[model samples]
Target: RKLILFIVFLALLLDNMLLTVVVPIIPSYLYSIKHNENVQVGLLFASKATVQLITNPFIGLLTNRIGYPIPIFAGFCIMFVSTIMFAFSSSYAFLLIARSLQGIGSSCSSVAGMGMLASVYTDDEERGNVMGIALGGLAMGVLVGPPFGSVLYEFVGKTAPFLVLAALVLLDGAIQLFVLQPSRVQPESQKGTPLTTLLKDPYILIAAGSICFANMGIAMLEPALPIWMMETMCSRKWQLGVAFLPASISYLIGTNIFGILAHKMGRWLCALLGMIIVGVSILCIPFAKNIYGLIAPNFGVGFAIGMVDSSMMPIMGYLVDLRHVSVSGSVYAIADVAFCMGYAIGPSAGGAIAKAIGFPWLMTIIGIIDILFAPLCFFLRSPPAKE
Candidate 1:
């Protein structure tokens, strides 16, 4: 179990590291290439999410059929290739393909990885805390990725950062191959849960919504924030990367603390409070007078996102139990879908919205929408009468 935990941690850490590594470099890279439109940049950023949104359900279903290990192996292979592609990418077309491949790779890994965790950590009492620990990899990855990529990009150039990541992927795959011997957990009933049934469950839907909004708020910042900082503060690229460090720190703290505390505090309450904090943080972001001013609110946003996710992620596993779905993959897949939706829309729509109305108004509207959704948490319930 410890081995499984460590492997999943490594997998997620690498996944998110690669995902966000592009953030600091991408805007400037595009500018250098003379494709400088914000909308195009947004599309390029959104492409990974777009592919994930389309592929997650299928990957989820595949995980249920074949079990977690094979899918995990497949994910690592794809990611390895994708990382290499990213290392050598010189054109928009190559970057787009590389990003799209990464989305598919991440979909495979995350759905299977979370499904594996849900399968192993069956007790609701412990699930939140355990998942929280594993998810710290996510925060750690995000914390390190931007600065790691930016510093490398500044010193060595583009290819070097991705080569380092690819080497990590290779090493991780070898570790999985040696340590992770496959044992499939077969459901008592082979019949899969119907998509409509899962979709119709209010609890499942709301949990997904919580995940969506949590991720969307962060995703919205990814493309827009750096540009805004540059315009407002005349910030440098390295600062753009370092700027996100505060949020990642808060996120790491929030996940572990909230993960352990959610059960006692009431999962729904944690989620609700997180959403409210997220809303306020978003609203507060544009009010920052300078780059330094962005830290407090960005920290608030990350911490709140951790609260929302830590509370809600275990709820996904509980929902499978509550709904009595024999297969866990599809339920976790739905969670992935929500995550993809947020990430997809965030960059694409956030770019256009920021372009049209300016960053301040864009944030105000999104923050307001987030707050408006907070009350919906009132309806969330995750356990069974038997419990």
Candidate 2:
């Protein structure tokens, strides 16, 4: 269990690491490569999510059919190649290709890996604990990837940083191939509910909306953040990375803290509180004129993300309990698609919106909408956790 859990942890971590490693440099990379603007920058980010949106449902369903190892194994190989492609690319279009390929890889590995964990750890309490740890890996990846990649990109050549990531993906692949063994809690012959049926559930409807909207607010910062950093503070890549560090720090702690709280309270209640906090905190960001003032609100936003995320993971498990679905892969698959769709929409819309009105008003509008939507979770009548 320990080793398998760790393998899945690495899988989730690597997915995020690959996605975020390029963040600090990408806006500039876009401009330098193609004289791109913020809208194009957002599209490039959205491109990765595009492939993911298309692939995650199939990957999740695949997990239901074959279990995790095969899909995880295949995902590693694809990612290994995709990273290599990214490492060697010179053209802007080529970078989009590489990112798209990586999206496919990430979709397979992330959804399958989570399915493996969910099925293996059938107990909700155990799922809560492991889910927090898994999300910690996500925060750690986003935390570590940018600064680390920036250091490599700044000190070394562009190719070198991606080559290192290529090697890292290779290492993760080898571990999946040799070190981790996957076992299933459900029989392979079972077919789960159709995607349409899953979506029709009231709990699922609210859950998906909550997940998508929360992530939209969080992801809107990706393209805009570095630009904001350049105008407001140091223009260096490392500083852009540093700006995100506070959120990572807060998310790392909050995932576990709030995961347990969601277990003690209801998941819906915790999520409601978390979303309100998230909205309010984001509104506070533009008000903070300096770096010192920035840290608290930034951390607060990330902490609220953890609260929302930790609560959401257990909610899936609770849904499984109510649905009595023998195959849990589809449950996780639906959730993954919700996240991917949000990832797809958030940056593109954010870029266009930020370009139009600037982030001050953009964030203000997003915050208000998020606060208003917090009450929708009450309709989630299913208790999100057991006492």
Candidate 3:
């Protein structure tokens, strides 16, 4: 079980790694290729979630029905091809197409990967820990990818970083095909709850909404933060990595710690406190006069986001365990759809909002919205699940 879980974790980590490696460089890469506008950048960032927003539910259904391995396998293929295409990208349209393919592949790997992790760990605390482990892999990827990307782009070549990603994914695909085990388990309940039913369940809705909104607030920062860092902190491309470094480091530690706390203190309470921390911290970012000042607050944001993820994801997983895991894997997919939707809306909104007002106000308003999620969580009736 631990081995299988680790497989999922590495798969997820690679997903994040490939996804973020290009982020630090995208502003320069696309701009150099003559796609200079913020909207163009925002579109590129939003492109993945756009596909995910539409396909996540269907992908979830597929995972529940056919099992986790198949989608993950298919995802590996699509992502490998897409990453290769990304390396060869010469035009903005080509880049978009490649990114779109990457998006489809990401949905396949993430939904199925997470669903598989949930299957192996029946205990709620165990679920939280494993989710933390998986998310920790994700945080590590985010932590490492950017700085590595900067170095690779500066020293090697434009396509060098991507070719490296291609190499990694190729190995990842080989492992999925040969070494990793098949989808050996199904949901606890075979004829589990349907997506329609989950929509009406208040607790499930709360958990899903918490994930959705909280993620929106976080995702909203994607384009804005790098822009802010570049304009305000350091102009050098490599410094983009440093601005995000604090957050990623905090997430790596905070996620594991809070996952344990989520088990002991209760999922909802932990999530609420985390959201409060996230909301307040983000609101403080624009107030900072120096790059050094941003680190501590960004650290708070990362930690809070990690804590919320650790707490909420398990509750959603347990909810799938709440009823049976119906045929659609729709329960998981429902959570996924909510998750993808939040991401879908966040970047576009953030980019537009930041352009119109400024990053300062963008952080301020989104932070308040995130803070609001806490009280709303207070009303939900969440308790631990059983075997």
Candidate 4:
């Protein structure tokens, strides 16, 4: 069991690493392909989130019935193909389609992998630690992907990175198939719960909403931070790479520390505290006039994200039965929708507002929203314990 769990963590870590490595590369690739239209580049980036929002829930349901391994394999296949397609893409539309497919692939892998992790753990304490380790894998991926992607792009060009990602996905998928055993739990029903039943659960609704708001803040930061840093520091491309390193290191440190913290303090409290910190971090971003000014807030936000990711799965684990761990996937799908909605809306809106009012004013508005929503944490119910 220990060995199996370790492999699961390894698989998830590699998966996220491959996905996030592409993020830093996206802006440069978009600029290279589309020289004049910033709006189009933003929209193109937003398209993947839109597709994820729509497709992820269905994928979750399928995972419940078929088991996680099937979707996990399918997701890797899609990822391999999509990365290849993205490498050859010449037009903005083609790249958008490729990214959309990649999103679909990613949604499947994430939902299935998380569901499997949640289902297998029987002890609440152990579950939190297991989930934390899985999230740690995610954090490591986020940290490693950007610098590695940037370095690879510099040496070999954009296509080389995708090819490398494809190879990693293939290798991981093969290991999961041949080596890993099937999870012990089965689906709640061969037919599964009706969508209406799942939708009617109020606790699920709260979980979904929390995920939305938390992810909204994250999506807003993804594109905005790099741009803000580059413009303020008047840095070269390599300097932009250097700027990302601190945040990545901060993320890994935060995840390890907060994962243990969640185990001691309880997931709900940890989550609320993390959200508040992230809110404060976002507000602080525009105030940063120099690169050094940004590091503390960046670390704070990284720590907050670590707290959220570490706590979230344990909360989900407590909420539903083993058979319905896949419901966590459904919940995450809803969050993905909310996340992408914010992603699509926030960047364009912030950019437009910044043009008119200035970046600091735009940051102030988002900060206010962040602080306003901090109270929502008060309503997060502890997950019910099993008999």
Clashes of each: 0, 0, 3, 0
Give the worst 10-residue stretch by lDDT in candidate 2.
181-190
Number of the top-ranking candidate, with lDDT as the measure? 1
Candidate 3 regions exceeding 4 Å error are 1-7, 32-36, 60-70, 113-136, 180-190, 236-238, 263-266, 317-335, 381-387
Taking the tens digit of each residue's C-alpha lDDT, what string does model 3 give over 164-188? Answer: 8889888887777565555454433
Candidate 1 deviant stretches above 4 angstroms? 1-4, 60-68, 114-133, 180-195, 233-238, 314-331, 381-387
lDDT computed for candidate 4: 0.65
The per-residue C-alpha lDDT of model 2 at residue 284 equals: 88
**Model 2 segments beyond 4 Å from truth?**
1-3, 32-36, 60-68, 115-136, 176-187, 323-327, 381-387
lDDT per model, in order?
0.82, 0.76, 0.76, 0.65
For the record, the alpha-carbon RMSD of candidate 1 to the native fold, in angstroms, is 3.6
The lDDT ranking, best first, is 1, 2, 3, 4
User: Which pairs, if any, clash in model 2?
Assistant: none
Judged by whole-model lDDT over C-alpha atoms, candidate 2 comes out at: 0.76
TM-score to true structure, per model: 0.86, 0.86, 0.83, 0.77
Residue-level lDDT tens digits of model 1 in 367-386: 88888888888877534432
